[PDB]
Amino acid sequence: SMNPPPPETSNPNKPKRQTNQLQYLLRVVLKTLWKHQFAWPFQQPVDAVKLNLPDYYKIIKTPMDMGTIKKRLENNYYWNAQECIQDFNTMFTNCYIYNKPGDDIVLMAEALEKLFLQKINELPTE
Numbered sequence: 001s002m003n004p005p006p007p008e009t010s011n012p013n014k015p016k017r018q019t020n021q022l023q024y025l026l027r028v029v030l031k032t033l034w035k036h037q038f039a040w041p042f043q044q045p046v047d048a049v050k051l052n053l054p055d056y057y058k059i060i061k062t063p064m065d066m067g068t069i070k071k072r073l074e075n076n077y078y079w080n081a082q083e084c085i086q087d088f089n090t091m092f093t094n095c096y097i098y099n100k101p102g103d104d105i106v107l108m109a110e111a112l113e114k115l116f117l118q119k120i121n122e123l124p125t126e
């Protein structure tokens with residue numbers, strides 16, 4: 001049992017809300033990053049068993065990925081946009097911590113982050 005349980009994508013006790021900013025995050029931000037050519041390694045939790053990365057979850061204690069973010073948006077898990085923005089940042093940060101600088105996966109994350117920040121810059125008013 002080397003993979004941890006994935007991050008939660010629903011919770012009956014966590015208050016839920018539908019807002020235009022959260023809709024924008026799903027329909028524009030996530031959608032754009034999801035279909036990008038570099039998205040696929042970030043589309044699901046890092047599978048340390050299948051990818052043979054035994055030390056991944058020894059190093060990364062706050063895992064996050066776009067598959068989880070997608071589910072959280074679809075399930076109305078978030079109350080606000082900043083929670084979601086934080087999750088994207090966690091995903092990128094993890095990549096920059098675990099992998100050495102100049103690694104292709106880091107360059108991929110950087111391209112996705114650049115695109116992400118552009119779309120967040122264009123976030124609609126509530």
Ligand SMILES: Cc1cc2ccnc(N[C@@H]3CCNC[C@H]3OCC3CCCCC3)c2[nH]c1=O
Pocket residue numbers: 041042046051094095098099103104105
């Ligand atoms: C999110 C994520 C996924 C991932 C998958 C596989 N391997 C990773 N780390 C490796 C560490 C050793 N150097 C090579 C790295 O993987 C190579 C990339 C090349 C581009 C396509 C994906 C695998 C991963 N690290 C992660 O942070």
